[model samples]
Target chain A: QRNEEKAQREANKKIEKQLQKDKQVYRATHRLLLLGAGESGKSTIVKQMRIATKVQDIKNNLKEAIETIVAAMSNLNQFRVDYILSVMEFYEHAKALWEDEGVRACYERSNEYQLIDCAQYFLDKGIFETKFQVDKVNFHMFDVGRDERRKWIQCFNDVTAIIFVVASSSYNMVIRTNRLQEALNLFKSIWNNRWLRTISVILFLNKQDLLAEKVLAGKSKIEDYFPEFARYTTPEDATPEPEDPRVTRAKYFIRDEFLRISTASGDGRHYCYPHFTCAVDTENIRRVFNDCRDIIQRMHLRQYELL
Target chain B: VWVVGMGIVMSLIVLAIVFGNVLVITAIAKFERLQTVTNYFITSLACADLVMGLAVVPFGAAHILTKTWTFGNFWCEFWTSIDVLCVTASIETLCVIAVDRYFAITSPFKYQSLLTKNKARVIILMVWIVSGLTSFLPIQMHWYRATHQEAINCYAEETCCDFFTNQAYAIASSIVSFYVPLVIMVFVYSRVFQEAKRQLQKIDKSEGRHKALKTLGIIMGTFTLCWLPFFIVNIVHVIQDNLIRKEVYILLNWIGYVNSGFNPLIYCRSPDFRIAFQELL
Candidate 1:
């Protein structure tokens, strides 16, 4: 009976060791890369994470924080209005010509990239040590600001997934001094790197809200800005509303363009998950991240040969 | 001899305000743990005080030494604007700090989201913008009478542009800048103290909470005592001319300046500040 009890104890120890090893493998940290051009909403997505994580403490209510953000947003809107009016008042010519719709539109669209008063914390590029978990897969989201693009090559190591953000409304605006090309080159480099072969790549076509506004206002055409998207865009309407099929077609075209750029170098097995996002809209961005969590889970299990 | 004496006193005050507030700002910026939402607001307050030390107080000292409007109309307007801007900004920032502290101690959970860097930046920006509007805009845009009547006695000349000369502007600005902020600060501080007391019942760590309360209370008390005389005298003068003596005006203004100098002393209650200040020295 003593010998039998000793054998049972040894069996229990073996099982416990196996369980500990499994737990360690299951709870492994996953690095997520946020990549994009200047003003492509990379930092903006990080800001959303900051909101979601409540700046690091997991027990904090994110919903309450979002409500707090919405409250602060209104106050900021009032200040922005005052600031615009003050600027117009300062410039005599601008004040006189401010009634003109053309000039007003110019001013309105001029600084869409201008930093909001609320997003100063994430302005400088740095690794935010917040725990972003989805379906048991923990994410260490890394972000680089536009100012630190030169050092982005340093972030490519040990990356599990990459969220490539791009402004869909760029077709209506200037491409910010080759920043679009720079983003594409960076994506290509990340994709081609032998160290990141099995990494999941996600293309987040951001600034959908701005794109919709530009399309509805008849500011610019996708075909006019991106010649490569000519085949995907539906025939232009003389007056396009936000809900127009052509607007949807334009968004799809933009997505396809990004997907095509990303998949150009891969073995065609690496799928680039395309998501349309409005970085400023917290609920929409949250939903997108939820979808991303599932994608990361599937890819991670597949890469590890667990599924 | 009188000029020399006043100049020396004013110079000393300026040096104190500058060096003291600079130390406070440096300590907040240096320490990591003290970089909470409340301390950021304190940093903003320290910044305004620093500006007052560097820009406004020295000009005031120069005026005291010269006993005349020697800087001409442009410099006079510039000096007046900077003076108003720094003081108003400082008061508003303190009010913001009070609000931040109240929320942080009352609802610690929501404070993270509620008092984010962005929200704090917005408040700081608004303080400066509003202060600028009250100070720079009126004089630069010719909204008020170019030469204030009180300028004759204050600057010993009729050409200098003094703030709070127009009755409507004076009343509105004074109410906004002083009374409203004061009311909000007092209300918030009292609520914070009550909340701390309630929490102290449940938690045994009342020592830290009690110390914090004492420090904040003394800071607020000193602030009120220093600024009340200045604002009251200014408002009284704005409403009814020559009721308060010129000497009283000078005395109260210096008392207000003394508040800026005392702020660093109040901040030294924090052990982090004390340690950082030692390193700074």
Candidate 2:
């Protein structure tokens, strides 16, 4: 009877190893989405990270619309107006990029580009439209900035994951933090959906090259200020907190704020990270991207089942 | 001693403006590195003022003091035309500069679209065309068309010109030479000042930005000193004719002439302009 039991255990282990080998690497043409404010170097860091990988195979899908909500210089009480201006500028940026032959080439080659002109589409304007196609496993992303694509109820069903990029830069005397906080709040509202409850989060610490150490310190203060996340840390596992220097230092390398803020909004940000890379490195990005893949794979195969 | 002291101070101030403006122009031209989109307007403003100093002021002063057509009719007409052209151009140039500066300070990211170098040149050309229509054309038509018809024997010309003597000329000159440019100056400079202060506040008075602000302060300061007197004198000349005698005209002409020179000084006095100037030299 003992011999029979040992044989059964060996047979089970062999079957498990076989399943792991057939897992297809869980690759779905992933990209580290650098969503953030304009000129926050979200696109740049993506480029840098991608280049660091030295992978010449990936085909970049989106075109750049490096724009954010324009600072409302006028005081006439209209967030919509300011938002419209931001969208209009994005349209202008898109028009220019489409017309530029060089920009088109660069984007296609990099397999990473930014979404532009969705600002208007998100508004009451009908001009902002996007198209998307999902065939079994491959998601052919086209014009995803459209409002229809932004439908959380549907997108969470299949959107493998997202990385929200936030800019560390801000304007003077305007209390500009409100807009950022508002964007985060909106992200949270959508992300709270049951479908996206399992999406992994990566908060890219962009523009670390500009003010490296200062940014690191500031981000520590920010993380420390959040009482909710501090509960997750212990003396032995204080990875991303002020009480721990390793995590605080790592936060300095982050580029985008959208993921950090949005995850807190309840978009399944169970795994927040501080990945440092500038606008030019492509390799480090591929590696960071591998983390996303690992998380997705883990989700698909239960932890106990994988073992 | 007091007279000498005041004279020294006045001279120093004038020198400051002239050198300041000259330095800005020099730096812009010599340093291909510093030639930003806004620098194009800066160079144009400097050039306009330079033209005024070289061609207009001494001649305007001569006309005011001599009270005779010592330069003769054609030369008189020519000097008047250039004086009007360059001064009008300078005023409009200042307006253009303010617009450019506004884009730089307020919406720097959009600046590449709004103020490209070639585009800046085109806008300047447009400004010149506008100035030409408003200032030069009317006066040209007044002098050239009138000279063709009338005999020079009419009181050896009672006023500057047969056409200029008319009510139409007075109204047109008043609008073109004084009204339009002044309104533009007030609007543009005020907006620019407000924007600068806003940007400064945004930076929380950081030292790195402090250098950037000096140019703005000089612009406002220079505008106040150089322009206020000219406007007051213009009002006096317009409302009460005897309030400005020929002798007074000469003194005031000196004052007005000095403004062309003052425009340049504002630039040279700036620290950034100074560094740029030294490198160029």
Candidate 3:
């Protein structure tokens, strides 16, 4: 059998004329997402991809276009700012402006205007009007507005994947701060559906220039700070049961999570590998992308076969 | 004997208030800038009027027509209690509006700072509590009397006391919800107008002052057109029993009832309020 396969390979190599089966037309379209912090080269990649792919249809773009978050209740109330800042100063490195009364109060009063804008914009521009083509594989991106992170929970259904980006420079962007906790509160309010779990997540250790000193000083490992990403592990060879509690329980932690270069100026495109040629240590990024593609393709297959 | 016509007339008047005031409340709720604490009270007042129309008016008429104790003596007591509560709640909400406007106009600069959302919510709650207490407590404790020569005795007749009247309770309720609040509203708004005039004087342009004066004039004018008849009727009632003819009482009551619906419409007509209303709508 091995000799036959080798013989076939040798026979195909020297042939100048195409075989009947070799001339057959085939089509395959894959949807790949790029996610992370605001201004972290998500849109930049899309623009570059359009030029590279030479694809005329720009509507397949999946990136969120604008900042539409409303002010929160905490940000609007002056009284809350004065009281909380005094207490926070005793513990943290420096007094953050979000801790101040005016800022905090505005954060409190601002109704979730961002998600409202996103959903309305998406529904009107993308879904209803065919501003976006859903039939094709597509990518959509988002970033948390200051203090409006709590409202992002509403955007869960709109995204196929989630990328959490953290600017390494800002100590104020505490992963475990009260505001982020506020965000987590909203997230937990809806017990995340395992099936809808974010498929691909690339957390950019953003603004590394600012944090390179701290990294060199060995203050923190970029991965160690965000233990939350560790939850997304490869599923072993086990079929989920019809009555599988995992059917519901899986979404919360079921992500193909990775940490990648998300800087706008940096060579983020190395994320696309053999599909495009690049010289960078992009193997991990490629692995993350492949996993997301597999997951989404399986979802599409299931839609045809099961749903 | 005369209470029958008054009851019929008052029922019509109250129904009009129910429809008209509900329209106003709905319009305010629908409109944007009109969603002040004052508008909230206005809505509550309309709600109270609606409750009164549903709970008390029909039963009170039933009692008056029969000219006897019917629908059980317990129901008589229940109807009387509800009647008092509805009236009190309605008046108290108006008083709340008066207080809210006072804070708004009297302390314009700090008004934004001083009058917090929670504070306004608390005041509305207090209005509900106090209104419930004063209105129902008196009737429950037998501080007021409800006697009907005819079977149908609506609250119009309840206010038109004949013999076993608890003059003190009547006076107290009238003072709390209406008299005192009216006095305060007049004083505060007068100050508001003066400040507005002072501000207008500082402006160099005539068009600005002209617009300012016109806006104030429309607001004050509408306030008088809506409320002055109701006030005059109450004053006339307080002064002498003979002035309380069925026709005049019915007409005055209609005027007051219509005022409920008129307010939201007035605010809705304003451009600033219209914008917010459009967004929410």
Candidate 4:
């Protein structure tokens, strides 16, 4: 009986080891491929890996620090550091290499092939420590001027997928004067372009609840915004359940108000496949997102068909 | 005693002017890395300042010291002609540099796209030609100097060359050389600093923008402070009767050249220049 118990324990150990290998070390395709540790501590080892960004920033400090040190190659010859008397030996090796005679490869030989002006211009003027960025993000907008970009957005377009959102109810306000009309023409400009045929916009016509309320109440009639609302009526195939007549006409009128341009010109492939939504209602927001998730999925899939 | 005292003081300004500008231009020409577009503008600018030290300030000193034009009217004509030319060139070159800096921090990425070294050469050429039109052209073409022989005899005996002219020439030349350039500098500085704030925002670092702006205001105010009073005294002295004394205008004229020496400090404050200056040291 003791011999039998030992055999069972040996079998359990084999299975546990196999499962551990499967979980962490092994994949079906991974025949253990690792292209690349030295008291690097139990807790401190984990701590080293923990603040990944901190490690990255420390690495960047080294990167920029070397940029300064290396650039001193050509520039060091420009200055006469005759003696170490008044010299800032504060960071002596930094001073030694930076202001020193040897490591002439860094000072003399670097400009042979290395040609980028990353000189810490103040390095010679002050202490010898390398000035590096910790919370570093240097914005390089060789793309455009900040003011010009502001004017473009404050007034401008290789954009990511445009959220072509509209407020259908804003048609009634018309004081800016027709916020809806402005968006209408802007969408026309967006959709009418031949360059945009492959780009699919996620169309959001929000404020459906308010739009429905305004049409039903008729304090401000849709007929005023669209005189054609009188001629338009509800079809039997209008909706899932019974919605109001004015609500159906006005809503679809605003819908066609945008999409009719997208339809007649869009050539079918490039179109804003839209849906009615209430932006403020969190429940509807989630529901609408779930419903329209496939719109992006299909668009993304179509673009990849270039494969 | 006073003549000797003022002569030595003025002569020392010549030293400061020559030393600083020669240092700046020599560093720029010799160093391969300092060959940037902005520095290109600075080269001609340094030349302009250096000319003030070499020619304009010295002749003006002789007149002030001896209380007479030891050089004849012919030398007076040439000296004052080049004098106006260099001063105008200096202001215009500064105007171009300000615009370049505006483009620099504004479109930091597309800086080379709009302007290049060849075009920059053309631009400097235009500045020099335009300055000549105002300074050399007016004098040579008789727009500034009188055509009358009677007037020439009287003017030569007047004993010194002064930047004196009719009311119209003062306003017109001031607009070209001083008023317009000053206005553009002020406007460009606003946009540049405003863009610097936005640039600071894009930088996640906390402290740079404030100190930069602090120094920025310091330099801007210094630049304006240097030139504003000169032009103000210039226009006021010309248009109004007895508003400015001859001595005060002379002092203001001297202050304008002080900006020449002042510029070398501002430029050399950068360690690129500091390093180059050290090369000289």
Candidate 5:
């Protein structure tokens, strides 16, 4: 009787394991992640989705609550000059003539900027998710801060797609330490990380509205700021002036820089699908998101062997 | 002259931490007997110490010797995050071990059934999650910057990340990772030792059991002795902000780093570990 009881328990345990496997197989939920540097429209894209879908789900409310917390707690403080001088002792020259405003600004309170209107509450690190249903499939959208990516990126395995956002207008501005270099380095890292190689990456060259203001309205050329971008610049004779009025040359410059790094990683298997967007533009973001949904669904079918 | 002497000492600590913990890990992996449920925690503890030895200690020693943050800004933050994660994980594992032993002594029959290998693995995972939440979350998210009055004064261009300078988080993390676990371990160890004495009286060869209990007590005692100065200084720095001298701060922190070197020796007190150590040698 004891042996029979033991055999029954073993059979039940085997059935339980098979049930778990089946549940995992039939689970319809999919994950799509938005990744980028701080102030790079990751949350703005998420907010656009919230406005686009117009979903009144509990998940949307939760996303708003998390955004409120993030906005209230984001690190917006300026770097102090004294602290930088103490650490980088190499810059003793700045200390000698510290009264200059330019030097002072560089040393103290570096890279201060106004927060975006849409994502005024986004924090540098946290996860915000929005859920929506399309054609009987449940889609879970994840937005995470850039700094938190290194430590928590592994936690979100089986991600259907990654949306990498970059500020096209941020060419002349610094993100705290290095100006555009930091953003480029961050992009290079996420692009080249071996673990994320197989995942489909969509490059959202964001802040094109700001790019026009900085380049056309403010006299700051992308080439002047990012000198290495000279390679992608067209010759004066060959270049057409605004035949394609919607897509500006400055926008193309930023997108080309990202694609340069994307292809530079030299993994032919991975190609970054590029999109230029102003996250606040409802029509533009809605179109991009729908395209993204199609790409993710296709990738999902291929991944789970359904297609 | 003293700089040279200090460099030598730091190097030796790095070497000892890396080699000693590696030996402990290899021995456990090699021996079937050392692969028990309780020893799983020990192996996990050794792995955390090994990370300290490999990742944290060498970089720290180099900084002390070179007197510059040679690697750069990214490494500064990366190393500081790793340092906090490994140290907090190590302390939390000690707390887990104390709990494991307390149960083993109090209810030997049920302990075998309750603290299975799968449970030990889950508990180890819990230790890492708790450690990451306490250390990595606050620093990476810059959560302390929300409450920090002097966030403008903070910079990471130098030796390491300045996130730990946030007094509120410093106190909160030290309390969670050190004091709470310390108190739990003390309570559990006291109960465990008391129960050990009662059990030894019933067994014929009480001598071996008494020695084992005493050895375990001394290991815990040494950990407290080594870490208390560092925690005290850490608290004082957060509270006063200006009282502790730089040299004294460095000395106290190095003493805490030395604790990683000492844990493998304490683990060798077990007969199985000793036998495994001999086989490896």
Candidate 6:
């Protein structure tokens, strides 16, 4: 492992030779894997590279918005109130709830129920465009679920690379703490899965804005849940851009959790390149997602022996 | 001048011990979510350490500095009783925590039902009762004295308010109070680590990559490191049929008391507790 660089160079050489010798002129296409567990901001990014079919889902979003609002009240009854204002711009009740101090409180306790993590983006007013071909980007984007992944891997068999989204702000709740462990656990399985061994995993540690919100709010330090954070220090990487020093360290620590996993098995054939993303921020996604495109492009070029 | 250095540093340890565990004690009470069987022991541990900070360390530090008891025999007996009770409760609480963690990681079915809040509370009650047996109750009864009224006066001479007694009493008290629970802690923690790793393995079976929990640091090792020397010196002093340097004796016991200071630090493993600590702090 210490000689990981040279070891990967050898592996890369062998792979290139095998493909070149076989004359495997694989056509270039990207089946970008937006992989993650339960909720990270993947749904919000799904909003970014979006489609018009979004109108149908918005109907349900308005409906489920009330459902979670009602559900949040189950616990909120202890400290809650309301008035009916239907919804507007996915805001109706959501708009009220967004301002509703009580509801905002409930949202903080989102780990208590099965609220759509993306609802916050929509309530502030989010997308689920799974498995679609895009002429603009010249690739396929397959969205998936967590209750099971065996079926999802049917899409994985031909994946060019993965964009694993994480609700990076969620280091401080009941199920949320486990939610992330599962996210990493989910990443671990995906990166190490036999079928996906040689695939690039582009990690979008999404929801940094919320992470900064949680982190700057200072209720929970990362060291509380991620004890390794006490000794963890990763201030600079590829960019000079940063956030509150706390969130900078917080975000990078999470990136490393996945990066550490991906790079370990990165024998030249695979890699995990990471970017800090706040999925709801459209431009943030655009810039970060744009950076990912280069990695994805080179991924297929090398995979198919074109590079 | 010398008193200023040791006194100031010693006072800070006392303050930290109080401040840290006071937060621990407050947090588990403040957060409804933290009221688990695991937290139950930590809370109890905090309660003892908090009392130690409030009642014990100041006098102990003064005794170390002055090398004599200005506080008199009544206060000496009371102070020694409280001191021993708090320290022994800490040992027992840690032992209980060790066993509870082992059961939690290893025994899926038994941990919750067997160690319900009521039963856990009962055990906590028992931890104090048992701690009392080793400290206050027996010492008050003068059971550790060798049938001598003058010896039973114990600290009439002030004798630095030390709890010197016959060999059997030293051996017996040290064995039950420290050795027995010490062995249990060592064993339970060893098993707990093994099983914790084993469970992570089950999760990592197909994936073959461990998440490497940060909680898996030398927590038990902290307990062992801080308290082991004190008990070892207790037994060694007893074996030599008399005593070691009083300074070494007092220093070793202070090291034992210092263990309480570190326990609250170990509680920062969860965001629930950490965030709770953040608010209270």
lDDT per residue (tens digit) for residues A1-307 in model 3: 8999999888887562454324221112223233233433333333333334532222122111111211233222233333433323311311233344643343332333222212222422311111122224333333434333345444555444444433333322333242223333323332333443433333333333333334454444433544653454434433333423332122212211111111111221112111211112234344434434533432322221110
* C-alpha lDDT of residue B30 in model 5: 87
Model 4: per-residue Cα lDDT over A237-279, one tens digit each: 4443356766777777677677667766754235455556553
Better of 2 and 5 by TM-score: 5
Q: Model 2, residue A248: displacement in angstroms?
A: 16
Two-chain complex of model 2, DockQ on C-alpha atoms against the true structure: 0.00
Model 4 chain B poorest ten-residue lDDT run: B200-209
CA lDDT of each prediction against the hidden true structure: 0.63, 0.49, 0.45, 0.60, 0.66, 0.68
**Candidate 5 has what TM-score?**
0.46
Q: Using lDDT as the measure, which candidate wins?
A: 6
**How well is each residue in B138-256 modelled by candidate 4, as lDDT tens digits?**
77665665443534654667465555666667778778988899889889878866755654453222111164566667667777778778788778866675697788888888888
Of candidates 6 and 3, the better by TM-score: 6
- Cα deviation of A22 in candidate 5 (Å)? 25
Our tally of clashes for model 1 stands at 1
TM-score of chain B of each: 0.87, 0.72, 0.66, 0.91, 0.90, 0.90
Clashing pairs in 4: A73-A107, A142-B109, A142-B110, A152-A156, A153-A156, A174-A177, A174-A178
Return the candidate ranking by lDDT, descending: 6, 5, 1, 4, 2, 3
Chain A TM-scores of each predicted structure, in the order given, are 0.59, 0.42, 0.29, 0.43, 0.62, 0.67
Show the colliding residue pairs in model 5.
A71-A121
- Candidate 5: docking tier: incorrect
Q: Candidate 3, A91: how far from true, in Å?
A: 50
Q: Stretches of candidate 5 above 4 Å error?
A: A1-307, B145-164, B200-213
Question: Could you tell me the lDDT of residue B199 within candidate 1?
Answer: 41
The sequence of per-residue lDDT tens digits that candidate 5 reaches over residues A1-307 is 8999999999999999998667554355667777766766666666766674543343344344333332333333123333432323322422233344543343233234433433222211156777865544556777766353586666556776777777776676644344456777777877777677566677676777766665665445555667665566532322344434323666666666666777667443355666667646766445544555544433322221122
Stretch of 10 with least lDDT, candidate 6 chain B = B203-212
Q: Which RMSD values do the candidates have, in order?
A: 30.5, 27.0, 29.1, 32.2, 32.8, 26.5
Ordering by TM-score: 6, 4, 5, 1, 2, 3
Worst 10 residues of 5 chain A by lDDT: A298-307
